[PDB]
Design a protein around this ligand. Sequence first.
Ligand SMILES: CCCCCCCCCCCCC/C=C/[C@@H](O)[C@H](CO)NC(=O)CCCCCCCCCCCCCCC
Length: 231
Amino acid sequence: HRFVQKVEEMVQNHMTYSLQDVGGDANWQLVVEEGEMKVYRREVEENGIVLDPLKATHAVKGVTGHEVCNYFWNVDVRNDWETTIENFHVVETLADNAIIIYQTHKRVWPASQRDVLYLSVIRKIPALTENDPETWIVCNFSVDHDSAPLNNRCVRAKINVAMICQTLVSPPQEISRDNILCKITYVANVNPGGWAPASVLRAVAKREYPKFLKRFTSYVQEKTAGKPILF
Ligand SMILES: CCCCCCCCCCCCC/C=C/[C@@H](O)[C@H](CO)NC(=O)CCCCCCCCCCCCCCC
């Protein structure tokens, strides 16, 4: 499909940069910590527009990276966990693992409602060596599409989001979900697409990202509990 090169560039950039430890960078601040979930943000505002890169890490017992990515990507289960949208639909299927999605978000007062149009791709990155972890990644990044032009009711946000998963399995005869731990890195780089009050945007991000990470990961645990493991 026409976006294959763009997908590869986006995936490679995440694998090169998004897994780099930000812990030693004074510009990256821990904003939320609960259990194994840590949420960090770098405050960035250019021409009044809040761009604050967000990075979270989590460690989720009893689920695999393949499972987590499947649930994050699969549009059929989207409304079971997502809480920030008014509607979404699939604009185009590019491949078995790549779709283009249009969605409108819930309005955050006092700003205009935001919409987004993004390619969502799920990819397995095989281990190259014995000690290299296998990675499952979902990348959601803005693309243009003639069937979803700009409209007069919403401001079009631009996003680059990834959910990046590596799975640790402890030696057991068969593997139990008690033996598996999914290490998650989630990154979100969002351009709100126009002015919005900085304090409001930052408060909403601080609330909504951990709320999502907790809700979504608990959902995957709930939906996979008692079921055969999909590695
Ligand atoms: C009632 C709350 C309404 C919030 C509306 C925020 C609109 C901001 C622009 C779009 C944000 C992109 C969210 C990414 C979505 C997809 O990758 C995916 C599937 O939907 N979900 C997540 O990654 C899970 C993402 C969950 C967290 C999203 C919260 C973002 C808040 C940002 C700060 C407020 C921005 C409002 C602009 C005026």
